[PDB]
Amino acid sequence: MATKAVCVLKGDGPVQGIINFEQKESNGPVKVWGSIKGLTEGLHGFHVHEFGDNTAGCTSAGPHFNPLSRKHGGPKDEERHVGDLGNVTADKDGVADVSIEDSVISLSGDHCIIGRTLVVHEKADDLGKGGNEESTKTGNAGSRLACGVIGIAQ
Amino acid sequence: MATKAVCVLKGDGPVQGIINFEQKESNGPVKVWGSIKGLTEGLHGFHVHEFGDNTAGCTSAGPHFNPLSRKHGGPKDEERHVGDLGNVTADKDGVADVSIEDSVISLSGDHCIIGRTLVVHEKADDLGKGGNEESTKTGNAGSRLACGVIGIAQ
Ligand SMILES: [Zn+2]
Ligand SMILES: [Zn+2]
């Protein structure tokens, strides 16, 4: 069973990064860390999308991974998509040194995110609190700057 | 339980392709089809490798996916790696039309190839019948020309 995964995020602009995942036990959290560069300073939505399909770049990854058909939320919310990892923050150099721990995604089982797509977005995810229709779907995080398929790692 | 998967192959050179996987029954075969271009005319090894890790390009994909610790063979041989999908054939325009049906790989359970890497190789795989060590490991198929993580598809 997988205890590590990795994702190489690429896109058509300056955004690119490598993100690691580790889950030492299948009943425990997944640690998510890595570095993405090229980002405008501040918050960027950071989500696992349903499909690991990059045939049309980031668009073919589909919507946020949402096997329980919930509304969009922030990672601390009970009402959230499985793929709702919230925001990552880039510094004044444009670098996001990601450090997230999440207990809803998994590397095995029904919430398994291996073979799905991680996407870093153009804007802040409002964590489902924006009061418009879009907030309940995407958090108003805007376009997909860079993405990659989440793969099993050694 | 995935029934469809896709893989976008890319590498440092011109080899590019999209390969689709479909498995309508969990205990049934997998259909594998699509097209790779930019290849030299002739046969190229076509394998699922163990890690869906592209951090160092196709090198970080590691060895052929081999959960049952067998020897390398062709896809019709009973002694084979789970990831041994034989050769694809490129025509004079450098295009390989891939169409195979395989009963050893799966899109679910312990042989599951989602999150691993499909790699197209520089030379013909000798199907484990070239009589040196290298043949029983890699089939002497040589360099990795392009690869991608195998992702869940709609
Ligand atoms: Zn969401
Ligand atoms: Zn092999």
Curated annotation (Swiss-Prot), chains A, B:
Outcome of swapping A5V: In ALS1; severe form; reduces structural stability and enzyme activity; increases tendency to form fibrillar aggregates
Chain positions of cross-link 1-(tryptophan-3-yl)-tryptophan (Trp-Trp) (interchain with W-33): W33
Ligand binding (Zn(2+)): H64, H72, H81, D84
Sequence positions bearing N-acetylalanine: A2
Disulfide bonds: C58-C147
Consequence the record notes for mutating T55R: In ALS1; reduces tendency to form fibrillar aggregates
Modified residues (Phosphoserine): S99, S103, S106, S108
Further information: The protein (both wild-type and ALS1 variants) has a tendency to form fibrillar aggregates in the absence of the intramolecular disulfide bond or of bound zinc ions. These aggregates may have cytotoxic effects. Zinc binding promotes dimerization and stabilizes the native form.
Protein's UniProt name: Superoxide dismutase [Cu-Zn]
